[model samples]
Target chain A: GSQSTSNHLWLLSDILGQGATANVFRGRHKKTGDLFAIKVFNNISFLRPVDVQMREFEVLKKLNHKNIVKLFAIEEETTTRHKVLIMEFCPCGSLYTVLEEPSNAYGLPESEFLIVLRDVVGGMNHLRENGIVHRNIKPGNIMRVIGEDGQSVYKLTDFGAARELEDDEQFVSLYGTEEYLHPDMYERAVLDHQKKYGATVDLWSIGVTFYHAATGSLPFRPFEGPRRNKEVMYKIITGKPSGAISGVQKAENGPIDWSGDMPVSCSLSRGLQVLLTPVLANILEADQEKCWGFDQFFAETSDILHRMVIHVFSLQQMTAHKIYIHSYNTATIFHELVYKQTKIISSNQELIYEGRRLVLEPGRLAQHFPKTTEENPIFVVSRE
Target chain B: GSQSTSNHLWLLSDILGQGATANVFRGRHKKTGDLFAIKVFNNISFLRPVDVQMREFEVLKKLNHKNIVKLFAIEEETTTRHKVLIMEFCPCGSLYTVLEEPSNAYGLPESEFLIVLRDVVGGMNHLRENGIVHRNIKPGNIMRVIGEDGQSVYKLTDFGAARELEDDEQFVSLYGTEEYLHPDMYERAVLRGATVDLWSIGVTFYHAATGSLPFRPFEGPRRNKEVMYKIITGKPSGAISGVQKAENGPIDWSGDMPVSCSLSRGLQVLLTPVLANILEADQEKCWGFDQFFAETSDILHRMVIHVFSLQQMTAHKIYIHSYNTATIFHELVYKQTKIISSNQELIYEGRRLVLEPGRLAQHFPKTTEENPIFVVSRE
Candidate 1:
C-alpha cells in the first residue's frame, strides 16, 4: 500500500518478465553511478505476485547455507512499485547452461559428474538437517557461484517451492518440478492430506539429475503436445529400472531401429552400460531407502572405488543402427589391439549420437584382423 | 572415451537456441510416453572440441547442486564419437528466449522478475560455493524450470567457460558475451576476471527488460575489431524502447514523457538529465512565448539562428522525448527566460524541433489579421 527508498535509485533498464505479479530491473545509484543491483518490483497484483514474493522471502530468511542463494535486501518502491527484492547479482549463472553444451551437449564426464553430485547433496544435507525440505531440486535450481578469488562453487537456491518440515511433520503440497518430483506417498489429479514427500525426494531428484549430467539428456525426458500429469508422475516415481529413462535409446524414430519396434514406452528405466553401474544403481536405486545418503554414499561405492581403469572403444553406424568395436584378436591387453575387417553390430537399433563410440561391452565383438591400417579408426559410413 | 545413451529417445522438436558447436534435440521415452534429449556435434576446427568437453566435464563431475545441471553420463560418439553427458533438461527455456520477446517487446513486471533472479542467483551462488565459476552468464545461459503446479525455477549451465579456481586468486580471460562484457578492462581490447561479467549482466538485465541489446558485438576477427571500436566510442542509442540517444543524438520530444531515473527538474532535462538546463516553456502543457520573452529585448538576438544550428548527432544534439500527446502542448512554443539563455549553449545539433509559435515574419505588414483562437487540425 506504500512506496519509496528506490525513488533515489534510478531504474536504468527494464524488468525481465513482467506480469500481474511484480516487475524486475537493474537499479543504479544514479547520481553517483555507485551501486548497481538486480531487483524485483512488486506489482501488488490482484494475483499472488506479492503473495508468492512474501512466501519465498519467509523461506530465504530461514536459510543459512553455503550452497543456497543469498538475499541481500528486501525494500519497497512507489505506487508504480511493489515490494522490490534487491538480490545478490550472481553473474556466474545457473546449471542449465552447463548441460546445454555447445560441445556435443552430451553432458559431463564422470570425475566432474561426481563432484557436482557431492556439492548438491551437501546442500540437500544442510537443508534436511535444518528441517527444511527443498521440495524442488532440479538442475534448473542449482547455481555455480564464482567467488572473489575466481573460485567456482556449486550452490542451491529458489525457495519458492520449499517447505519447512518443522511446521508439519510430513505434509503434502502438489507442488514440485515434474521431472524431479519424487513419488513416495501421494495421490493423482486432486492433491490432499494423504499426499506428501520428504527430504529424500532430493535424493531421487539428484539421482536423475546426475543421470542427465553423466549423459547430456535427462533420464526422464519431457514431451510436448498433450503432456500428461499422471504419466509424468509415474515415470519419475518408477526411477530407472522401470522408469522412462532407458526408452530413449530404443524409441521408434530414435537413432536406432527396433526388433520389437522399440515398444511404444516400456519405461524411463535405468539403462547403463558404463562401468559405474553399481555406483549409479545405488544412487539411482528404485527404492528410496537404499539410496546413498551423504553419510552412506562414501561407503556404498567402495567396490568400483578402487578398481583400475579399463576402457574400450566402439562405433555406431548412425544409419545402420549397428555398433563396431576395435578388435585385438581376443587379446586381453589394454593395448596391442588388431583391426582389419571389423564388423559393426547392435543388440538394439537406435541412432542420433553425440558420440565417439557407442562404448562397447566386455562381450563385444570377438574377432581380430590382419589386413587393415592400425592407425585408422574410421569405417566406411553407409551414406543414408 | 565412449558415447551412446539417447538411442531409445526420439527427436521430438528443436530445443530452441541451437547452432554450431553441435545441435540439440528432445527425446521421448517410447513406452512411458515420456521425454528425453539428444545433442549432435560441432565440427569445430583449430580447437579441440573434445578437450573443452572433457575439461568442463571434470569440473562438473566434481561438484553438484539441486540447481546445478547434473552430469549423468559422459561417453563419446564419432571422430567420431561423443562423450555424451546426458543431463537434466530443464524445459522452462533460457533467459535468452525469455528476453527474446515474440516480436514486439514489453518488459516484465516485478513479481516474475523476482522469481527469475532469485533462481539465477541461487544457481550461481551454488556454482561459486563449489569452486566453479560459470564464466558465461548470459540470458541464454540461465534456465527456467516449470513444475507440476507450474512454478518457474532458474538454473545455470555452460561450464565450458568454467574451470577450477583452485590455483588462482582471480582470472583474466578475454572470453565472453559481447553484450554482457565490461568495457572498463583493457587488454588486446579485452580483459577480465569474474567482475567483468557483472557489468555484462547489467547489460543483460537491460536487454531482458527492454528486449534488445545494449551494444551489438562483432561476428569475426574483423567484425570483432569493428565492434570494439564501435562499442568504445559508439554513443549508446536507440536500444531501449524508451527515448532518443543522449545529447548529440536525435531528440524526438514529440510528446515529452518522463523517463526513468531522469532529472525530472525540467522537461528538456527529461530528454537526458545531463542536459537538464532547460527553457521557460518547459513543463507547460500549452503556453505563450513571444509575450513571455518579457526579459531579453533583443528580437535581433532571438532570430533562433544563433541558437538553432543544424542538428548534430548526424542528428540534432537536442533530442525530443516522447510522452503522451494527450498531455502535450499543441500551440507549444520555445521562448528564452534567462536573458537570452546563451547562444548555442545546451545542444549543438538543434536535434528535435518545433518552429517558434509567433508568426511568419508578420507577413511584411500585409494581410495583418491574426488572433489567439487560430487552430491546426492535428493540433
Candidate 2:
C-alpha cells in the first residue's frame, strides 16, 4: 500500500554523460538533498534476454571499494518502469574529459599520472581478485573525484560491459571500445565472433588506457583513421613494440619504422619518463607470454611512487647534498639526515626557504617540495 | 493529483532532542541518503490555531546565516499531515551537553568559551539585524557542529519563541528557560523582547564560565521563580561580587562575582568585566550586542596564551596578536626563546595546530589552562 503511494524520489536535472545503453543525469534526493548520478537505461534492445539486461546491476551490487564507483540503489521509473541506477556522483568528470583539455594533450603531469596509475591498478586488482572482468577499461569509464583530503582519486565506473569470469575461463562475447580491445578479440569479434576471450584481454585495454593517460593518445592507430579500416588497426596492435611506438601506420601495408622512441611527452620529467616506459612496454605487449603480470607491474609502479630526490644546502659549509628520500617523508626524517651529513645542529637553526620555516612534520615536505626545483634548494640557516 | 501520490519522504530515526513545542529527530531522505534534523510538532494544543503551530517554520524560513540553523523545507507527514521542519543537522549536539561534562564542572576551557561567546554573539547580531527577536536564548538552544575545516561552530536553533519584532516593539508573552530569563521579563511578560537576548547571553556566559547558574535560592519553589525574583531584583548581597545565593543571607560578594577556577587569570580579567556590564539588571546601563561583540573581539586579539613543551620542560607565555602562523612562530623564535622552528608542534586537547590563516583562534583562543597547548618537538 505504501509502495503505491510513494512517488519517484529521484529529481533528475542536467545530463552528466551518455553511453550506448544509459544516460546519466545529475540527480538530487528531493527530500534529503543528497546528490547522485542517476543512470537510466533507454537503449536495451527489447529482443535481448532479461538476465543480460540486469547483469550490470547484479555486477555493480557486489562491488564496494574506494576505487570503484558505488551503486547506492536500483529503482524503476514509476511511469515508464525504466531500469534506473543510483550511483556515486563524481563531480570531477571522466578521465577522458580531463585528457581532452588542450594543456593535457601532451599528457597529465607526473604527479597526476601517478594518481591515475595507482587508482586504476587498485581498481583492476580488486576486480581480478573478485574474479570479475571489466571488458571495457578506457578513460571514459574512469571517473575522477576530489577526495575528502583534497587529493584526486580515480575510480572505475560504467559496468555495462563487465561480467564475472575466472582468470582461466573464457567468454566468447566481445564488448569494449575498439581502440582499447585486445587484437585477438578485435580480429575475432569483427571477422568471426567465435574466439574465446580470457581475463588477459583487460590487461591489453589497461595498457592502451595507461598509454593514453600518459601521452594523451591511443598507442595503436592507422594513418587514414581508427574508424576507417578496422583490420589495419588490428594488424598494428599485433605487431608488438613497433606498433606501440609507431602509433600511426602511413599505409595499409606500410613498413614499420623502428626509429621512433617512446612517445612520452616532454611535460614529464626524465626520471618519471624512465619509470613509466618499462611499465607501458610490458603491459602493451601483444603476446601474453611477453607481458608483465600484475605482480611485476605493481612492484615497478610502487618503486616509482616511493622515490623522490630533493636538494638541501648548508650555509656553514656552503655545500649542497642531493637527498634521496621517500616522496612523502616527515621533515624530522629529512632534517636528521641533514644533521648527520652537514654536522650542523643548533637550537637556533632554521630550515628557511622563500621566507618561511620548513615545518618538521609528515606531509609538509611533500606539500612544499612540489614548489621547489633542483636549482632552488632549501637553505639551513643558523639564526644568530 | 500528483502530490497525492507522494508518500512521506522523511525516514525518521533516533530522537536528537526535545523542546517544549517540537521533537527533533535524526532523519534521512530515503531516496537521497542526506541527513537532517526533522523537527516535528506533536505537542501543539488542538485549541491553538494553525498559523501559531507553523510560526516556528515561518520565522526560520526568513533567516539564513552561518551562525543560524538553516531550514531546508517545510513538509507534512503523508499519513497524519503533522507539520514538520527539515533543518540542517548539527552533529555535535548543544552547548548545554558540552557544559555537562565533568571536566567542565568549573567552566569551559578558555578556547571553548570564546567559541561559544563568538558564535552566540554572531547569531544574536544576525537575528537583531533581521529585525527578529529571540525571546529565548540559552546554551540549550545553541547547537554546535564541526565545521568543514575541523573546528567547532556554534549555531542558533529552535525559533519556537522567536518572531519578527522591531527593537522598540514589545511582545506580550512569557517564553524562555527560567534561569536565563531577564528579571524584568520574569516579572512581566509584556516588555520589549529585543534586550532579553542580551540578558540570556550574560547568564549563558556566566554558567559557561563558572559551571553554575549565577542566581540560585538555597531553597525555593519549583524552578526557583519566587526566590530568584527577589535575589535578582536586590542589590549586591554583602561582599559576594556577581551572584546572590539564599536571598540576602550574608552578602557573599564573593558569590556575586568571579569566573570559575578553570579559566585563565588573563581571560578572567577581561571576561568578568564584560559579564558585569551585560548582567546589569538596568537595561539602560547594559552593553548591547554591538558593544559586547567589539569588546570580545578586542580581548580575543590581545589575549596571551601559555605554551609549554616537554623538550625544555619550561613554560612560555606569548602575546598572539594575530592568528597567522608566521606571526606567532616569529614571536616564539625572536621574543620568547631560541627554539628550532621545524621541530615544534602545537597541540590543544590532542588536536594538532596547523597553519590556517585567521583560524588559529579556534585552537588557541585564550586557553583556560596554565599551559593551553602542549608544544612537543619531533625527535
Candidate 3:
C-alpha cells in the first residue's frame, strides 16, 4: 500500500491486537523508522466522543515520563473508518501475558520485579506530582518492554481512567477492575458523590498488583459453582481475605499450618509472605484512614523488595553449592530437590508449585483459564 | 441600670472599648448571668462600610474550635443605632496589652509558651482543616482570657482578614502588617494573595508573642516603626517577626545584619539555637505537592510554633539549668544590672564591655528593658 506521512499522521502494515475499546496495530515511521503501536477506535462505538477522544489525546500528550508509554503522533484514518492513536510499542507486551506464560517464568527475575515496582511507582509519582490521578492501575493495563539485554522495562498505559482533581469536583466512579476496587468505593459511595478524590485510589490498584505478584492470583476471587462471578463480586464488597497466610513464615519447613487447607500448588517463599501479608492487610482495612496510602505503601513495599532481592541473590549463590552434590536421579532432580525442601509447596491438593496451573483461580478456571481454540489462539503466551 | 435578658436578646451595663468599626461593650444575660463581649457596629457603617461585615459574621459563625473565641449570637437592635455581635469575653484583654505590659505577661509562663504555641497552631490548624485561612493574625487580633487559675489563655480573635479559599476565586489583597509580609507578597503584589496574608499573620504574630522580627525593618525614620503603624499606613506590609527570629537567631550580634538578626528582648531561654535553626530550615522549605494548599502563612506559622514547642519540650529536660538561670536573671538581676549597665557613671572612656555614651542600636534599650524609659526620657 502507498504510504502517506505527516507530522501528526503515519501509515503502517502490522496488526498487533484487539480489545473491547479498540484494535491495536504495529506501525513504522516512514522517515524515522521508529516502531509505534496504533490504537484504532471505531466511530460507531462512540456518539459525541469528541470530548473523550480529545481528553485522552490531551492527557497522553501532557504525560511525558520514562515509565509512561509515549504518545508520539495521533492521526485520523478517514479512509479506514476509524480514529487512530499512535503510541510507543512495548515489545514484551502486557504484564498479563508475562503472568500467564509459565515457560517464560513470567520473564521476571527478582531484579526485573524490582524494576517493575520502581517503574510503576515512578509513573504514579509523576502523575501525582502533576495533579493527575490514574484512577485505574492494573496488571492488564501495564505494558512491559523487553530491552535487547532481556531487561523488562514497564510502562504505565491506558489513561482512559485518568482524572484531574479539582477543588470543587469530587469524583466517585464505580470504575476499575472489581478485584482492585478500594473499600471507600463501596463504604463512602454516597459521600463521594461528585466529590474529588486524590491519588489514593491508584494506591489501591497498586496493592492489588502486589497481591497478584505474590500469589500469582487475584486476592478477591469468585466462589465455587455457576454463580461464581456474582458470589465473587459480593465477597469483594463484603468478605475480606482470610488470614491463611498471615504470620506464616516463608522459610523452608517454616510453620505454615495448611493441614486442613485446600490444596493449591505454589511455592510460598518468605519473600512472598512478607510482601503479601501487609498488602492484604491494607487492602482489607475497614477504615479508609487506617489503609495504607501511596506514601506508606511505597515505603513499606520498597523495604520488602529490597530485602527480598538480597534473599533471592543469596539463594542463587546457594544453588552453586548444591550443584556439586550428585544424585542418581533424573535431570530435573535439582528442581525436585528445591521444591521438596523449599516452603513453596503447600499441602493443598489442587495447587501446583511452578506451572501455569498455579496462576489460575480455582473457582473461575472455566471462564478465566479456558482451553484455547484455533480461532481464539493464545497468541499472548510464549515460551522462553 | 436594669438588664433585659431573653433567648435571643441580652443587655448589659459596662462599655468595654471602641474600634474604628464598632463599640465593644461587656454584656451580661439577666437570666443566665453569662458574661459576653458585644461589638456593635453603626447601622450606617453596615449600609455603606467598605468592610465585608456580613461575610465576616458568616465566616466566624461557621468556625468552631477551642482556640477561637466563641460567637454566641448576632442581633439587630431596632432601638439602638447598630447591629450587635455577641462573643465570648476575654478577661485578660487584647494580645497587644499583654505584649505591652510584661507584668501581666498575658498569664503566659515561661514553660507555657508551648501551650500558647499549641493554641495558635490549634486555631490555624482548625482554620486550614476547615479550608479557611485567617489572613490577619496580629497581637491586636488575638485575645487573652483569664483562666480560673489566673493564667492568660490565648484565643484567636478577629475574622476581618479571614477569607474562604474558593475554587475559582484568587486572593489579591495587599492588606497586612508590613513586618509580617511574606516575600511572595512583594514579588507578586496583590495577586500573590489569600495565603500570603496568612503568612504575614504567621511571621508577625509570632514576633508579637516571641518578640522578634523575621525581616530587616526599613532604615528610614519614617519607615522604621512598629509593625502596627506600618500595617495601618500600607508602607511595608506584614510583620515577619518569626521569620527574623528563625533566620537570625534570638540574638543577632552583628550590627549590619537585618533587624531579624537582632535578638528579641522577650525571647525565652528554652528557645535555643537548635530549635531556631530547625524552624528556620522548615520555613525555608517549599511546600510539597500535597501540602502546598495547607502550607499557607497561618498554617506554616502554626506548624512552626508546634515544632518549636516540641523542640523546646525536648530540650527543656536536658537544659533546665540554663533556662532557670536566664529566668532568674530576667526576673531579679535584670533590673539592677540594667541600672548598673546603663548609668553614665558606669561608662568607660575606651572600648570594652562597659557602657558607652554613643547611641548604638544594640545599646539602645529594648521596650521591656528597665532602662528603656529612662534612656528614652533622657534623650
Candidate 4:
C-alpha cells in the first residue's frame, strides 16, 4: 500500500496473461523478494490510448479501503515503453476465471457469495465516500486474496475504469462493459447525460451480477435465435423493468416476462426468496431515480444475512452446464435442519430475510448432514 | 493421448507462463471445445540445438501412467516457426508455485505428503519400466491433476532433461539441472548410474517435505558442487525437524526450512535409515528401501514403507539398461539439417516428419526428397 517516490528494482516472473490493454507480470521486490502485482500499460495509443490506464493509477491513489486493492507504487520507466502500476498481488487469481467455466458454474457457496457481495459493496461505498466511482464492476476486476486471518476475502481491483468525481458529468464521458450496467446507464452508450447519475451504473451491474451468480445464466437473453449480442442486449433494456408497481404501462408495450426462465432454486422457498426479491426488484428498478443506492442496500440486509447459513453439497464432479440445466434433487439436503421441525421461519419478518445473507454472524448455524439419495424428495414444493 | 494425423484447429487462451524451452498456452480442441495445454517451443534451437527437447518428447511416448502427464499431440508448423505440444490442462497450476514460499507452506497434511510421494514414485517407476529416465524431477516437474473422483493426483511432467536409454553410459552427452542430482554427477560432467536419479528422488522428497531448497538453486558448476557435495556426504545444514516433544505434533508449517523443531517418530524412522543409502558412495546399498523398511515387513504385512514418494528404491530397479534394452548410445548430435529447418519441413512431409517417431532406431522418418538426415527436434 506504500507508494514509491523513487525507483526500486522489480523482478517480474510468471506471465499471468496479456489483456487487451496490458500484460500482467507477477512482480516482486528485487531486494526483499516481496511479491506485488505489476501491470504494464504498453504505449500503444494508436489503437487504444494509455490515458485511461494513466487515470486508473491516478485514481487508485485517491482512496484506500480494506476491500479495495492497495496500490504499492507507480513507475514510468521509458516513456516509449509505457508505465507499470504495482499493486498488491492476489495469488488465487481472479473470480472471473472461476465464474467463466462450466465446472465452477453457480459455484459460489452461500458464504462466499455473501463475502464478495459485501466486500464489493463496501469497496464501492469507500469510493463514493471519497468522491470516486468505480466504473467497472465485472468479475475479472474482482480478485480473491487470503486475509491475514486465513480467510479468502474478495477485493475490488483494476481502477482502469474508475475515476474521481468533481465538477463533472456522469459516465456520459465513456466506459466499457455495457452488460453490468442498469438499462438507463446502458443508454449512455448512445445518449449523453451528466455526472449526476453515474453511481447508478455500478448498482445496475452488480444487480445483474447477483442474479447471474445465483442462477448461472444471463437473466435476459430474451432473443431466442442466433441474433447478434447487440440486438439481444437491446431486448433486456428499453423494455420498462419491474416488480410491476411502476413501469406497468411501460411493460404493456412489450410482454417482458422471465417468469418461465426464472430458476427453481432462486424462486423456491419463502425464506430464501424473501431475501433476494426486494433488492433484485430495486436493482432492476425501472426508474433511473429509484435504483437501490449502494449504502441503502447495505443498511437493509443485516437480519437474514446474519442469522443462518447452509451448504447444499449436491454431487460434485459435475459440469456447470449440467448443474444449471439439471433438475435439482432437494432430497439430498435440508433433512438435517428442516425434517424434524416441519417448518422453520422467524416470526419476525426482519429476522426472516433473504438475498445474499450476511455471513459474518458471531455464531454459525448448525450444519445438518442428510442422505444424498435421489429417490427421497425433501422439498418438492414447486418446480420452476 | 494420440498424435493427430490431420491438422485440427486449436482455440487458444490463457498465457500461463514462459518456460525455459517453450511458452505454455492453454489450448482448446476446436471440434469438441475440450481444453488442452499447448506448449509452443520458441525457435531458440538455432542458437541452442533442439535435440534435448526432441529426446524429452520422444521419451514421452513410452510413458503411460496415471501419474505421468498425457501428451495428446505435438506439432512443428511453418517454415516460419517451430514445435508445439498439446497435453491435458490441469487447472491447479503447479507445486513449484505452491512450494515457492512459506505463506503457502506446511499446508500439506500427512495425507497430502503421502499422496504426492506415492504418485511420483508410481510415475517414476512407470518410466523405469519403459526404460526412460526422467532427468529433472522436482516440485516444478511434479504437478497435480484432480481426478474424476475429485481427488488430487500428483503427476510428473517436464521431460526437458529426460530421455530413452538403452545402455548405462551415465548421462555423459546431455544434462539438465544438477541441483537434484548426485554430487559425482557433475564430476563426470555427464554421468548416470541409476543411483544418481535415485538420489534425485530423495532430494526431491526432502525439498517437498521441507518446502524449501536444501541448498540454493543451481549456480554454476563450482558453486553447485559445494551444495551437491554436502548432499552426497549427508552433511546437515539446519535443524531438520527434530523428534516430536509433545504427544502432539507441530501442526504449523509456516516456519522456514527444517519446518518443525522436532520431527515426528514416523518421519525420524523413515529419514534416518534412508539417508545413509542415498548419499553412500556404494550404489548397491543405495538401490531400494531394503535398508529402511527391510526386516520390518513382519511389522506391517509386507507393506514396504520407505519414503512416501521414496525409500528403498534401488538404483538397479530404476536403472534403464536392466529392464528395456535401450542403447543408451543414441547421442542426439546436432548438425543443422539441409531442410528448411522449420516446421515447414513437417507440413511438407505430410505429417510423417512430425507424427511417426515411434523409435530411436529411426529419427525423423523421411523428409521426402532428402534422406532426412535423422535430426530430431522436440517441443
Candidate 5:
C-alpha cells in the first residue's frame, strides 16, 4: 500500500478526553490557527493492525450531520508519523458533566432533559438511518454546545466502537459501557460470550441513558457497595413478569419491594413523568423481544417532546409565589393567571422580553421565553 | 436582547487573515488547549449594526459541508463580550498562495486547475442548493487543505457577504470584491440574482486557467482603480474585449493569457466555452450553475492523466480514463521499449513508484505538467 502522510503542526494544549487506547487533546493548527480536537492514538500504533487503526476513519469519513461530530482531517504526528484524527471542538462539556452538576443530582430539569433526549435520539436516528450502530452509547459519548441559535445542541462523538450493522444481520463482537449495556449482552460479555448482538442492543443502552438523564441515577443497582458487577447484572437480568426491574434491596437476601410505583424523580414535571413511565418500562425491558425498537422509541419521545406540558415560573420575589402555565396555552391565559396572582390587570401588566413587549394574544408561554427559567424569570412590570 | 455568554478562554496567537471589519487569528482554548481560527470583529462592534455583525454567523450556522469551512461556535471576546467566530482551520493556505508560486505564473497545470475548479464548483453548488448567494467569491476566499486521501481539497470560506437568495429572487444591495463582480451589477448594484456567483466563478476559472485576472488595467488596480472599473463596466467589457495600456495605449485583447498557459491546449479549448457563457455582462445572457456544472464536469470526465518519460523529451499521453502502475508500465515503457516490467522503474519527484496495479495514484496521487511521473531504467 502507498502511504501518503499529512504533517500538520498542531500545538497540543488542554486534554479533552482520555481513554486507554487514545488521548483527545485540544490542538491549534499551526498554519490555519483553527481550533480542533486532536485524538492521538497511543504510541502502540505499530502493534495494532492497520485495518483496525483505519476502522474509525472509514466510518466517520462518510458521515456528515450536525448531530454527529465532524471528522475534519486525518494527519500524522511530525516525529513518528503517528495517525491522529482532527475533529470539531465542542466547547461546552458533555452530557455526563451536565448530569453530574449538583443542582441536577435528582435529575435534569424537564426542559434540559427534553433537549438532551432530542439530540441523542436525533444522533442515533442518523446513525441507524446510515446503517451504522454505535456500540457505545452513553452520557459521555454525547457532547453539548450552545448553537448560534442560542440553544443547546447535543452531538454524538467517539466512533471507535461503531460499525455497519443492518437490522436483520447480527454482530458477534460485543462493545459497550457496562452500566448502559443490555443484561443479555452484559451476561454474555462477563460470562462466556456466544450471543450475537443486533442493532436493537443500542436501544437498551438508550433506555438506560433516558432513565439516568431523567432521574440522575442508573435504573439498576446492587445491595453491595463499590459496585459488585454480578449483583447488578443479576438485578437487571431478573425483573418482573411485565419486564420491569422489581426493586433495589439493602442486603443480598433482603425482601423485594415490588411496589407498583416507578422511581421517577420529582425534578421532572408530573405530566412528563407520566409520559415517560411506560417508555422507560418498555425500553428497559431485559427481553429484547419485549423491548421498544428505535422507531417506537423515537415516536414516543417525539410525542413527549410535542406534548403540551406545564411550565412553572416565579414572580421573581423572595417568596413562594410561582405560576404554572401549560406550554400550549396562549399568553392570554398566562396574563389572566398573573392578574389572579398579582391583582394587576392583563391590559396594564407588561411582560418585558427581548427588549419588546411579550404580546398577549398570539404568544405561547414556550414561544416567548428566551433562556428563561425558574431561577431566571421574565421581568413583569405595571406599564407606566 | 437577552445575552447568554460562552466565555471560552482563547489564547490568541498568530494572525490568519486581516480585513477592515475583522481579523482572523489562530487561538488555543485556554482550558482544553484546542486550536481554533477566531474571527474577532474590530472594536467597532459598537458601530456595526447588530444584524450586520450576525449575518455571517446566521449564514454559517446552518451550513455543513466539507467544501465549506465549519463554524465550531460563536463566542464573545472575554474582555468586552465582543463578537467572535470559532471556525475550522485549513493549514494548507488558500488558492491565491498556490497561484502566486512562480511555477504557476502562466497558470495552474491542467490537473491542479481541474481540482481547484471541481472544489470551487462543489462548494458553490452546495451554497446554491441551499439558496445562498456568496456575494464575495475570489481566490483569496477559497481555502485549500490536503485531505486524508492525500488530495488537495479546496473549501470556500469567508462568508461575511453571503445571503440567502432564491433562484428567481433579486438582491438590490451591493456586496462583492470589485474585480469579480459582474459589470452590470458593479454599475447598478441592483436586481441581482444567482448569476452574480456564476460570473465570479467565471472570473476565478479564467484566472486559474490563465495566471492573471481576465480584466487588468495597464497601470494595475492600485493606480488605476477608476480605469479598471471603467474597463470592467465599459462596452464589450474589458474581460471579453480589450483594455488600453495607457491614456492612448493600444487595446490589449490578449486577456492576459501568456504566450503559453500551463493548461494543455485541449483543456484551454474545453474551458473557453464555460468562460464565455459565464462572463457575459447581462444576467439573462449568462450561463446558470447547471450549465456551468455540466460543461466543467464534462471536461473533468474527459480528462486523462499526462505522463512524461526521462528517456524521451515529448509527453506520453495516457488517454484511458483510469489506469494504474502496471498498465502504465506495460503500455508506456514496456510496449515502447523491449524491457520487462521488473527491469525498469517509474519515479515521481524522487519517490520510487511501486509496481502494483493500484499503487500509482495512491502514491503519486496528482500528476500535472508541474509534477508528472517519469519512467527510468535501473542503473
Candidate 6:
C-alpha cells in the first residue's frame, strides 16, 4: 500500500518539555489523526538560523528507519517570525523518565535492556550509513513506546544536533546536555575540528547511556566544593571518570557506601554483566580510538541479547515482584545520590563555596590553603 | 612493449655524485646492465648520526609514482656499513644549475620553462593524488635532462623531506631555501602545512625565473636598480646580463607604455596584458589563497604553472634595461634650489652685500645737546 497519504502537518499547543533552544510538544496530524511530537524553536539566535533548522529537517527526513522516530511532516508558522519544527509523537514519554523519575521507577530486565540497546544501535547505524552523526545521544532524547502489556519499546529521537559529512563544515557549536557531552566536545570549543571523528563519538555517548541504565546514576558526578568542581570538569574533559564500581560499597568507603545498596539485590546475571562490563569499559576508555563503532556495537549487543534469552529459558518464572524489588532498591539509592547529593545540593554548594572561597582567599594562597594561620612564640622566662 | 622490466632493481659501479646523506653512483644489473643510479648512504652516519636515515628510507619506499624519482632497489652494504638506494638518473644536472648558469646566459627559454613547469606539475599532481605532501619544492630539488637539440626536460628529485598524511599531524621542522620558502613557512616555525594547494605559488617562482619577483622584496633596491646600474655603467653588469632586451628603446617617455624587455615580455605575449596585469595586481595585493596549498608548496607550484601558461599568451616583452631607462629618464626628474645666506654666515662676512651695496657706509650719530654730555660720561 502507498504510504504517501500518511504525511500531513500537525500543530502542538502544549509544551511537554523545554531545552536550551527548543520546546517539545504533544502533537497530532489533523488529517491522519496520527499522534506526533513537535519540538518548536523558541528563539532563532544563530547567524544562519534557517539553515540550522533546514539541516535538522533534512537529516530527519532522510533517516527513515524502524528503530528511529519517524518524521511525518514539518509545519512552519506561515506568519510567525520564529522557526517552529514539528516531529512524530512518542506517547510513552522518554527513556529518561523510565530511568529517572521516582514514581515512574522501572528497570529494563536483561532481555528488554538488550532490545532497547539494539534499537539504539540500529538507529545509530542508519544515521552513520547515511553519513550523518547524531552528536547528542542521551536518554532524554530517546523516546519510548509502551505496548498493551505495559512494556516500553525504545526509539532514537532528536536530530537537531546531528551533523553531516561536509568539508570544513562548522559543527563545533556547543550542543547536547553537559552531562552526556562527549569528552572531545567539552575539551575544546570545537568538536572534532579536524573532521576526523566517525560514529565512535556517538558510541561514547551510548556508553554514557549504558552506564546510566545500569547504575541509574551518571558515571561522572559533580563535586562538593568549588575546587573539586573545577577538578571534576578537567577530569571529565580528560576522559577520567572516578573508577569502576560494581555496587554502592565499591563506589565509596563503608560508612557511607556510595555505590548504593540496590546493585547488590538488583545484581545483573553473570552472563549479562560479562557482556556489558567490557562494552562499558571500552566506551568509557580515555582513548577515543578504543571506543566501539557500529560493527562492534552490533556484534556485542546481539551476543548479549542471545545470552539473555538463554538465561530467561533457564529461569523458572519471570517474577514481577522480584523485578520490582530490585528496581525499587536501585531507584532509591540512585535518587539519593544522583538527584539529592549530586545534581541539586552539590551544584548549589559548589557555586556558593567557590564564590565564598574566591572572596576570602583573593590570590594564589587562597587556592592552596583556604585558611590562614597566626604566628605564636614560645619564650623562656628571662628572670631565671 | 611492456615497461614492467623498468621496475626491476639493478646495480652498477659508476659513481655519479654525493649529497648530505647519500652517495650517488651509476649502476647496472649484474645480468642485465640496464641504466640506473644508486644512492648509497654512509653507514657510519646512518648508525651514529643524530637524525634517523631508516625513517627517511621508509618514507621514500612508500612513495611510488612516475613524476617523482623512483626508488628501484634498497641495498645494505654490510662491509662498508652503508645503505644504497638505486633509481633512474637525470644526466642534465639540476634546475639549480640552469638558474645559476642559464643555458643560454638568459636562463631557459620560455618553451623550456613550460616543459619544466609540466614535469613539476606532473610530480606534484601524483603526490597530491596519493595523499603524500612534498613540503619542500624548490630549484635544487628539480633535475633536468638535456637533449641532443639542447632541450631541457625537467623532473622532480629529492624526497628527503617528504611526509605522508596523518590525522592531527603537525610537523614543526623548518626546511627549504629561504628565498624560495613560502610566506607561511617563514611566519611559523612549522612551514608548509596544508592539504590541497593551488598553482599560483609556482607561478610566483616562475616570475623569479623571468628575473623579477611578483611580490616586492621586503628589503632591497627598487625593481629598476639593476637596469639603472647597467645604463650608468654602460654595459651589462652584476646579475642583469641574463636579463633579456625588448624591441622598445632603452628609454620611453610614454608613462603607461608596457616595458616589454624582461620575462614579462614573454609572459605578456602569451597572456593578454590585461590578465597579466590582473595576476600582477593579485600578487601585489598579497592574495595568497591560490599561492600555496592552504599555504603549502604543492598549491604554490600548481598556481605557478597555471599562471605561467596564462601569462605566456598575454605578457608584453619588457626587459630590465628598457624598464630602467624608461623609468629613470622619463619618470624621474631633479629639482634644484640655491640656499639663501644664514644669519650666522652673514654676520661672519666682513662686509654684508645688502648693507655694503657699492661702498661701506660709516655709522652716523644724531646731533643733540645731551649727546655730548652722554659721550663724556661714557668715556
**Per-residue lDDT over A236-335 for candidate 4, one digit per residue giving the tens place of the 0 to 100 score:** 4435445621111113234445442235554233234446657766665536666666567767544335534332222121211101101222322333
lDDT for predicted candidate 1 compared with the true structure: 0.40
Candidate 5, superposed: residue stretches over 4 Å from native? A1-384, B1-13, B167-192, B235-243, B255-257, B305-379
Candidate 3 stretches greater than 4 Å from native: A1-14, A17-21, A44-51, A78-83, A104-109, A167-198, A223-228, A241-268, A284-287, A305-384, B1-379
Off by over 4 Å in 1: A1-24, A29-53, A109-115, A167-196, A222-245, A249-384, B1-379
Error of 3 at A128 (Å): 1.9
Q: For candidate 5, what is the TM-score? A: 0.39
Give the Cα error of residue A202 in candidate 6, in Å.
0.5
lDDT of 6 by residue, A152-171 (tens): 66788776556565423322
Question: Mind giving the per-residue lDDT tens digits that candidate 3 earns over B167-231?
Answer: 32121221221111122221232223334333444344344444444343334212333422322
Over all chains combined, what TM-score does candidate 4 have? 0.35
DockQ, candidate 6, comes to 0.02
What does DockQ come to for candidate 3? 0.01
